[PDB]
Amino acid sequence: SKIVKIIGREIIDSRGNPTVEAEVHLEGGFVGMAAAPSGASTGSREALELRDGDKSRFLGKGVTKAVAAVNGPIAQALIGKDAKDQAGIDKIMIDLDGTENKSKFGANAILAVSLANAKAAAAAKGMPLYEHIAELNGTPGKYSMPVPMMNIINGGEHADNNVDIQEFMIQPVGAKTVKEAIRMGSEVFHHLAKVLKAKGMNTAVGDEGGYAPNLGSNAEALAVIAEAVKAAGYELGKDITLAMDCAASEFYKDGKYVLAGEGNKAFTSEEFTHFLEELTKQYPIVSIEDGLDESDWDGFAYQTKVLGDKIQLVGDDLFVTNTKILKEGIEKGIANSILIKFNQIGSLTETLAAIKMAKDAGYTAVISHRSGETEDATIADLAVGTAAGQIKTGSMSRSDRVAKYNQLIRIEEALGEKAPYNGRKEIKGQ
Amino acid sequence: SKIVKIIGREIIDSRGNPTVEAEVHLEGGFVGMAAAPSGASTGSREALELRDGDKSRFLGKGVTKAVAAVNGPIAQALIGKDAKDQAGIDKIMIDLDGTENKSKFGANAILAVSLANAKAAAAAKGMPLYEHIAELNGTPGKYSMPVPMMNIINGGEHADNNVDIQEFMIQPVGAKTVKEAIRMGSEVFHHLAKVLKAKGMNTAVGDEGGYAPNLGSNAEALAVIAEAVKAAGYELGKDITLAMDCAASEFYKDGKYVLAGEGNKAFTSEEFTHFLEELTKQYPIVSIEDGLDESDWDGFAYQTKVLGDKIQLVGDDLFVTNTKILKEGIEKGIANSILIKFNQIGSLTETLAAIKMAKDAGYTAVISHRSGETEDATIADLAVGTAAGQIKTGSMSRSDRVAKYNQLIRIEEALGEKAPYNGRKEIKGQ
Amino acid sequence: QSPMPLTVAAASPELASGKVWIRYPIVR
Ligand SMILES: [Mg+2]
């Protein structure tokens, strides 16, 4: 199914910043279209998106250069090529970019084209993208509906309150389908607004569609959620479990961990993990992301020891979707899970490779959104088509989040029990 | 182009509440999919969406009954019919429902199908929806890119602040293309965040993706907007004009308009009109929505005599997209513009009639979003395909808003010079 | 015949939502 035309354009993301969209058109008229979510334009360990830095446009966040890469050199190198050969398409772009971190064309240029191509190929085969991804994965007809961790309360750098933990999430583990899991998420989300209103707190939303109210402490955060869950008529632990993202690099000071929100007690790697431990016995927190700084490997080894058999330990900043760090982390015994952000690597073939590496080590792969998203719902098809088992795609508001939940509903409607919702058991240590 | 299958489903809107999605399939494999935004389930003047009122699901906001109507009686009636005959399809559904306000099946069921059908037919004709809409409108090949009024500051019932005005919006009238207009909106949006953060104010967003910071007066809202426009390198008046939605009924009592953001000053309707006049003399406010209570027709007649030749006076609550009310308003010299909310009427055919009524009278039609939106971008194609000339679809954040902006970029790319961005002259009085 | 038939809208939400369009004449 030969590529005949590829159209790159600058559109706007969920935060109002430019990103790259690509359309890939094939002989026969098949078309696929995808957009890159927001990434990093600087950084040493991840694929870099290309920003223009022209201060007279979008405050320097233009993507006209990445768009020109798509329309010119990338397109020209792909015209006449077989869209079905995803590995081959991805390879052409990676080789032509010629850098290790995709910094010449931008991870934004290459990823948009990678995903649009996969979509066009699925169309040429008369199948949904999730079906085509399973085929690309060498696992045809193997699916699941992912268990979502839904943002609900934000702290740390993601708010202006006295909560130290960056986000608390809910997971509707007791649902029997993803449709039911979405409904439970929605109900708790609305009951949470009522609870915050009743305390005269703010219910405006952040980038990921959750609340960032003026909570006095971490414990106040956990308490309002527990209250919302009960108000919604569910039981914490059985129906709904808790996940968190510490973003522990944020309070890492000269080898120690300082949590202002709590007496400023400045913990050692060791004491911070027992502190987390204490939360996990007090609340059904079953997943902790970036529970220590990403350089603090000897500390992570300790956390993985203490909590690893009981609790999901997710690397985001820790791994940044980088198989070299992941490989190294598996052998050392660091964490048990990994956040998968396809823009941190930059192609669908490399993404499939990262997921497979995790899986092969018994690590869980959590398919993740970014802070800056679009209406694009590719990660829904990705989570299902790789049977990853878990998704992190936002709260139950903002269409940049809820488009993904909607696509999951559509997919489950088509697949039924061919894509089981496995609930609690997807979560590492559960 | 024969309809062979219609599918309805319960999906989630931008506020986390259910809404109806419909897929219409035609002989030959053409398919159109659309969703209804959120609307009123009660009231006596507009079309009514159907809600389930089952407290055990979505806090009573399920739409399983509306979805059942789509899958059952609607699908069975429309199977075998020609999707190209838009008026025919809409008539079948309206007759079958049999109520004057679509309350048997729901305006949400009927609209989702009406729109899905129009998309399917467009695909059967090998054209985008905006092009099909122009043909349905009797104005083939006549397009414009609409001038957006973009939410920026929220007050009244949409905030917890001392601003009486429900919303302030910017209009990038100095832009040469809608693509430019969208960039100008984005830049001002981000600079506003900077301004508000420097003031220690909250930059979390409301339903429409704009800010609702704790401003102390109506004057302070205008001042921070002015500072943001300036900070972005633009001139108020020349590059960017202001529109407002007073929602004046929210502060109407005992026949007086009472403004807390004016230190609780009371105004008669003639006096409020003169208050608005002075505002338009000090700030480049060129559009004013619902500037009096909906019941205040004597007041609106006066307001239209005083301001109407130089200011766009937009009926929202005033007309609720009801051609019966609009016809009377035109007869009585009430306002000079109308907000078009297609889910308040409930079918594409009737929507086209409402826009046409407005235009025939020299009133402007402003295509509007709803507070509860989806990733659907139908209103973009609607504004272009009717050459409505203006759109109200949110701030420059949340993909429930920004998906419409992205669609205008796509359409403008496709049409170029065939779809002029006419700038300020689209606005009534300019 | 549609160049690009969908069994269900989920197979290409972008084409089913009208955010991308088939380009005619179809290159073959
Ligand atoms: Mg209004």
CSV table of C-alpha atoms in Angstrom, one decimal, chain B residues 170-326:
chain,number,residue,atom,x,y,z
B,170,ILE,CA,-11.2,38.7,22.4
B,171,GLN,CA,-11.6,38.9,18.6
B,172,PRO,CA,-8.4,39.0,16.5
B,173,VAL,CA,-10.0,41.2,13.9
B,174,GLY,CA,-6.6,42.5,12.5
B,175,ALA,CA,-5.6,38.9,11.4
B,176,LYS,CA,-5.5,38.2,7.6
B,177,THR,CA,-6.4,34.5,8.0
B,178,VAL,CA,-8.1,32.4,10.7
B,179,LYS,CA,-4.8,30.6,11.1
B,180,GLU,CA,-3.2,34.0,12.1
B,181,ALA,CA,-6.3,34.8,14.3
B,182,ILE,CA,-5.8,31.5,16.2
B,183,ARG,CA,-2.1,32.2,16.8
B,184,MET,CA,-3.0,35.8,18.0
B,185,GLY,CA,-5.6,34.3,20.5
B,186,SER,CA,-3.0,31.7,21.7
B,187,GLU,CA,-0.3,34.4,22.3
B,188,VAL,CA,-2.7,36.6,24.3
B,189,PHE,CA,-4.0,33.6,26.2
B,190,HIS,CA,-0.5,32.7,27.4
B,191,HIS,CA,0.5,36.3,28.2
B,192,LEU,CA,-2.7,36.6,30.3
B,193,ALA,CA,-1.6,33.5,32.3
B,194,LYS,CA,1.7,35.3,33.0
B,195,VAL,CA,-0.1,38.5,34.0
B,196,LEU,CA,-2.4,36.6,36.4
B,197,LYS,CA,0.4,34.5,37.9
B,198,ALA,CA,2.4,37.7,38.6
B,199,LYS,CA,-0.6,38.8,40.5
B,200,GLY,CA,-0.8,35.6,42.5
B,201,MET,CA,-4.1,34.7,40.8
B,202,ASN,CA,-5.3,31.2,39.8
B,203,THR,CA,-4.8,30.2,36.2
B,204,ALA,CA,-6.7,26.9,36.3
B,205,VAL,CA,-9.5,26.9,33.7
B,206,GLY,CA,-13.2,26.8,33.5
B,207,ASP,CA,-15.5,24.8,31.1
B,208,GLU,CA,-14.7,27.0,28.1
B,209,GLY,CA,-10.9,26.9,28.8
B,210,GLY,CA,-10.4,30.5,29.9
B,211,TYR,CA,-9.5,32.0,33.3
B,212,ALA,CA,-11.7,32.8,36.3
B,213,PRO,CA,-9.2,34.6,38.6
B,214,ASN,CA,-10.3,36.4,41.8
B,215,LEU,CA,-10.6,39.9,40.2
B,216,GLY,CA,-12.0,42.6,42.4
B,217,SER,CA,-14.1,44.5,39.9
B,218,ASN,CA,-15.3,44.7,36.3
B,219,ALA,CA,-12.6,47.4,35.6
B,220,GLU,CA,-9.8,45.1,36.9
B,221,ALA,CA,-11.0,42.3,34.4
B,222,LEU,CA,-10.6,44.8,31.5
B,223,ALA,CA,-7.3,46.1,32.8
B,224,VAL,CA,-5.7,42.6,32.9
B,225,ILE,CA,-7.0,41.8,29.4
B,226,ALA,CA,-5.5,45.1,28.1
B,227,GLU,CA,-2.1,44.2,29.7
B,228,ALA,CA,-2.1,40.8,28.1
B,229,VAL,CA,-2.9,42.1,24.6
B,230,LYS,CA,-0.2,44.7,25.0
B,231,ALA,CA,2.3,42.1,26.4
B,232,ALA,CA,1.6,39.9,23.3
B,233,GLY,CA,2.7,42.8,21.0
B,234,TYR,CA,-0.9,43.8,19.8
B,235,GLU,CA,-3.0,46.9,19.9
B,236,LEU,CA,-6.5,46.9,21.4
B,237,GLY,CA,-8.9,48.2,18.7
B,238,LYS,CA,-6.5,47.9,15.8
B,239,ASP,CA,-5.6,44.2,16.2
B,240,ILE,CA,-8.0,42.8,18.8
B,241,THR,CA,-11.5,44.0,19.8
B,242,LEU,CA,-13.5,42.8,22.8
B,243,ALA,CA,-16.9,41.1,23.0
B,244,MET,CA,-18.8,40.4,26.2
B,245,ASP,CA,-21.6,38.3,27.5
B,246,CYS,CA,-23.3,40.1,30.3
B,247,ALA,CA,-25.8,37.4,31.0
B,248,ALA,CA,-27.7,40.3,32.5
B,249,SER,CA,-30.5,38.2,33.8
B,250,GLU,CA,-28.1,36.9,36.4
B,251,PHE,CA,-28.0,40.3,38.0
B,252,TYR,CA,-31.5,41.5,37.3
B,253,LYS,CA,-33.8,42.0,40.3
B,254,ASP,CA,-37.0,43.9,41.1
B,255,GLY,CA,-36.7,45.5,37.6
B,256,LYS,CA,-33.2,46.8,38.3
B,257,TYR,CA,-29.7,45.7,37.2
B,258,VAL,CA,-27.4,45.5,40.2
B,259,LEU,CA,-23.6,45.2,39.8
B,260,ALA,CA,-21.4,44.0,42.6
B,261,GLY,CA,-18.3,44.7,40.5
B,262,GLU,CA,-19.5,48.3,40.4
B,263,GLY,CA,-19.8,48.4,44.2
B,264,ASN,CA,-23.4,47.2,44.1
B,265,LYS,CA,-24.7,50.0,42.0
B,266,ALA,CA,-28.2,49.7,40.8
B,267,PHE,CA,-29.3,50.6,37.2
B,268,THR,CA,-32.6,50.8,35.5
B,269,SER,CA,-32.6,49.2,32.0
B,270,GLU,CA,-32.2,52.6,30.3
B,271,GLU,CA,-29.4,53.4,32.8
B,272,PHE,CA,-27.7,50.1,32.2
B,273,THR,CA,-27.8,50.7,28.5
B,274,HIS,CA,-26.0,54.0,29.2
B,275,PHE,CA,-23.5,52.2,31.4
B,276,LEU,CA,-22.8,49.8,28.5
B,277,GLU,CA,-22.5,52.8,26.1
B,278,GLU,CA,-19.8,54.3,28.2
B,279,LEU,CA,-17.9,51.0,28.4
B,280,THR,CA,-17.9,50.9,24.6
B,281,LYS,CA,-16.5,54.5,24.7
B,282,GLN,CA,-13.6,53.6,26.9
B,283,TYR,CA,-12.8,50.1,25.6
B,284,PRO,CA,-13.0,48.6,22.2
B,285,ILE,CA,-16.1,46.5,23.1
B,286,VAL,CA,-17.9,45.9,19.8
B,287,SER,CA,-20.2,43.1,20.7
B,288,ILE,CA,-22.5,42.6,23.7
B,289,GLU,CA,-24.4,39.5,24.5
B,290,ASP,CA,-27.6,39.4,26.5
B,291,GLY,CA,-27.1,42.9,27.8
B,292,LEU,CA,-30.5,42.9,29.3
B,293,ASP,CA,-32.9,40.4,30.9
B,294,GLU,CA,-34.6,38.1,28.3
B,295,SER,CA,-38.0,39.4,29.6
B,296,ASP,CA,-36.9,43.0,29.1
B,297,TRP,CA,-38.1,43.7,25.5
B,298,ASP,CA,-39.0,47.4,26.1
B,299,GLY,CA,-35.4,47.7,27.5
B,300,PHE,CA,-33.9,45.8,24.4
B,301,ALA,CA,-35.8,48.0,22.0
B,302,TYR,CA,-34.2,51.0,23.7
B,303,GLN,CA,-30.8,49.4,23.9
B,304,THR,CA,-31.0,48.6,20.1
B,305,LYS,CA,-31.9,52.2,19.3
B,306,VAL,CA,-29.1,53.6,21.4
B,307,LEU,CA,-26.3,51.1,20.6
B,308,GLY,CA,-27.5,49.1,17.6
B,309,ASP,CA,-25.9,51.1,14.8
B,310,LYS,CA,-22.4,50.8,16.2
B,311,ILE,CA,-22.5,47.8,18.5
B,312,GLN,CA,-23.3,44.1,17.9
B,313,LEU,CA,-26.1,43.2,20.2
B,314,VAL,CA,-26.3,39.4,20.5
B,315,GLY,CA,-29.3,37.5,21.7
B,316,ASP,CA,-28.5,34.2,23.6
B,317,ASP,CA,-31.0,33.6,26.3
B,318,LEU,CA,-33.0,36.2,24.4
B,319,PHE,CA,-33.7,34.0,21.4
B,320,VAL,CA,-32.5,30.6,22.4
B,321,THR,CA,-32.0,29.8,18.7
B,322,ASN,CA,-35.8,29.8,18.2
B,323,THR,CA,-36.9,31.3,14.9
B,324,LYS,CA,-40.4,32.1,16.4
B,325,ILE,CA,-38.8,34.4,19.0
B,326,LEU,CA,-36.2,35.7,16.4
